[PDB]
Amino acid sequence: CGIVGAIAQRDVAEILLEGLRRLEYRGYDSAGLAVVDAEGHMTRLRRLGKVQMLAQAAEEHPLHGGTGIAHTRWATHGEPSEVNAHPHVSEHIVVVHNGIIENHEPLREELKARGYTFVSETDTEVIAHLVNWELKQGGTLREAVLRAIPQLRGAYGTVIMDSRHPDTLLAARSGSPLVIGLGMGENFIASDQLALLPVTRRFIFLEEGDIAEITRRSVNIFDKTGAEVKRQDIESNLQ
Amino acid sequence: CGIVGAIAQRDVAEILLEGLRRLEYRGYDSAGLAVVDAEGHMTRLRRLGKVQMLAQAAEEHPLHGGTGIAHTRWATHGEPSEVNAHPHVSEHIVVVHNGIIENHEPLREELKARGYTFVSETDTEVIAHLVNWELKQGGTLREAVLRAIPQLRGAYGTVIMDSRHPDTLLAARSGSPLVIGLGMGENFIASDQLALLPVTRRFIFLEEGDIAEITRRSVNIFDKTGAEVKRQDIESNL
Numbered sequence: 388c389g390i391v392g393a394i395a396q397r398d399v400a401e402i403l404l405e406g407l408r409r410l411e412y413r414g415y416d417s418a419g420l421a422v423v424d425a426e427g428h429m430t431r432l433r434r435l436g437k438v439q440m441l442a443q444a445a446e447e448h449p450l451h452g453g454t455g456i457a458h459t460r461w462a463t464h465g466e467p468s469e470v471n472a473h474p475h476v477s478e479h480i481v482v483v484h485n486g487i488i489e490n491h492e493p494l495r496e497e498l499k500a501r502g503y504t505f506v507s508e509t510d511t512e513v514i515a516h517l518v519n520w521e522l523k524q525g526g527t528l529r530e531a532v533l534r535a536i537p538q539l540r541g542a543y544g545t546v547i548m549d550s551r552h553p554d555t556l557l558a559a560r561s562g563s564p565l566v567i568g569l570g571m572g573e574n575f576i577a578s579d580q581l582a583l584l585p586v587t588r589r590f591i592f593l594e595e596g597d598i599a600e601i602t603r604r605s606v607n608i609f610d611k612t613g614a615e616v617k618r619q620d621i622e623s624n625l626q
Numbered sequence: 627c628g629i630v631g632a633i634a635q636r637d638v639a640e641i642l643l644e645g646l647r648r649l650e651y652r653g654y655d656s657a658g659l660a661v662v663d664a665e666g667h668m669t670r671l672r673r674l675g676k677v678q679m680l681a682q683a684a685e686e687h688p689l690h691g692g693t694g695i696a697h698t699r700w701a702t703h704g705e706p707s708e709v710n711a712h713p714h715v716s717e718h719i720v721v722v723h724n725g726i727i728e729n730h731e732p733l734r735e736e737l738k739a740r741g742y743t744f745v746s747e748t749d750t751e752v753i754a755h756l757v758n759w760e761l762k763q764g765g766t767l768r769e770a771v772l773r774a775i776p777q778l779r780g781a782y783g784t785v786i787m788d789s790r791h792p793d794t795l796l797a798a799r800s801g802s803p804l805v806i807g808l809g810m811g812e813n814f815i816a817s818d819q820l821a822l823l824p825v826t827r828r829f830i831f832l833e834e835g836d837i838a839e840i841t842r843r844s845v846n847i848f849d850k851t852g853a854e855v856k857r858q859d860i861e862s863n864l
């Protein structure tokens with residue numbers, strides 16, 4: 388239900404937690420985050436419960452790394468539990484997701500035949516294993532995500548990262564909002580601009596069907612056929 | 627003329643240079659910056675001429691480090707030259723300064739007598755040598771600055787760092803404006819809030835006579851008797 392992501396030189400865990408504090412929708416049930424450092428070391432922490440519980444856990448095990456994604460969940464598929472909380476993983480592929488993957492069943496079956504173990508009951512987890520699958524077929528994360536997204540049906544927003552290549556985040560808007568926040572030598576993404584105001588006031592709103600490749604220094608947006616599209620940045624005057 | 631400073635986890639050179647670009651409208655003859663990394667390695671680059679010239683040189687000497695100060699100068703003491711541009715140094719003490727130190731002559735002679743060599747013709751350089759002097763007497767950078775400031779007369783603002791302890795910046799407002807910009811796990815300072823808008827919208831204005839010690843995580847403000855004062859932070863989108 389709430390997504391925040393960041394790709395920066397500085398540690399982003401505190402920015403992600405502050406973003407989640409700004410995305411605490413009535414009835415959400417769990418929260419989690421994953422950060423990866425420059426050497427590809429990933430730390431993921433999830434909790435059934437409130438962002439404050441996650442924040443307290445993060446205080447104990449300080450999470451270093453300039454690339455990360457975080458999520459508050461409002462469960463639709465799978466009961467609230469830490470196992471089902473986001474980020475979900477498929478080895479090096481880490482995903483957070485808002486909305487629903489309608490065709491999760493057939494997809495889950497295909498991936499199971501490809502040798503993938505599902506550990507959660509969520510529709511989300513199919514996104515992770517599928518991008519893992521596509522990436523195995525060769526190409527960059529952007530290319531794999533371009534192949535993946537058409538296979539997914541439903542109303543969703545997702546941000547994906549590959550812990551082996553922590554210099555890029557991929558994001559796709561396909562029935563649920565996402566907005567990019569532009570920083571200086573760092574970039575952010577959230578499902579609501581309100582999450583990002585502490586660190587930037589300049590935004591690019593993704594449009595329906597947009598897939599964005601975000602690095603510390605560049606934002607490149609494409610549609611599903613892989614065509615590059617131009618989206619305007621705007622300065623927000625909200626406090 | 628324009629001052630920008632930053633103390634962050636990320637490299638700050640780009641933020642400093644952008645801050646200077648935002649200050650060019652005030653006019654200036656030279657500009658410079660200094661950044662220090664976590665290990666105390668200081669890189670200083672100065673140019674007679676435009677910020678764009680400095681930014682170009684920075685592109686060849688990519689400056690790494692999370693603590694730094696930068697300045698555009700409008701010369702009052704000493705002709706425009708790279709030697710007279712700030713930041714000025716005294717070994718590990720590095721200073722940028724707006725305004726004038728009216729009593730620079732007596733202090734310069736005093737510090738010359740004390741063994742310092744002045745490389746520049748600026749009043750500014752006395753600040754660097756004086757803080758270096760006071761620090762030799764013992765204490766923290768904050769303590770040394772508290773002892774230095776009362777010796778200076780003039781209408782000025784200054785930001786000071788010690789490359790040996792890159793986790794703190796000291797700033798003193800004594801007749802020329804300075805504003806702190808509050809970030810998340812980083813803090814900034816400038817002579818004009820316009821310099822800081824790209825990175826934050828929350829500010830604390832230093833009041834006359836305030837001496838601030840700024841770290842990545844905290845801002846502690848004192849008066850000249852060393853008393854802690856509380857200043858209000860305000861949000862200001864321009």
Ligand SMILES: N[C@@H](CCC(=O)O)C(=O)O
Pocket residue numbers: 388389459460461462463464465471484485486487488509510511
């Ligand atoms: N359907 C996903 C995401 C729900 C949401 O948008 O929070 C889940 O149940 O985990």
Ligand SMILES: N[C@@H](CCC(=O)O)C(=O)O
Pocket residue numbers: 627628698699700701702703704710723724725726727748749750
């Ligand atoms: N008096 C100092 C500072 C001038 C300024 O405020 O730019 C100098 O001449 O370098």
Ligand code: NA
Pocket residue numbers: 539540541542543561562
């Ligand atoms: Na869709």
Ligand code: NA
Pocket residue numbers: 779780781782800801
């Ligand atoms: Na004064």
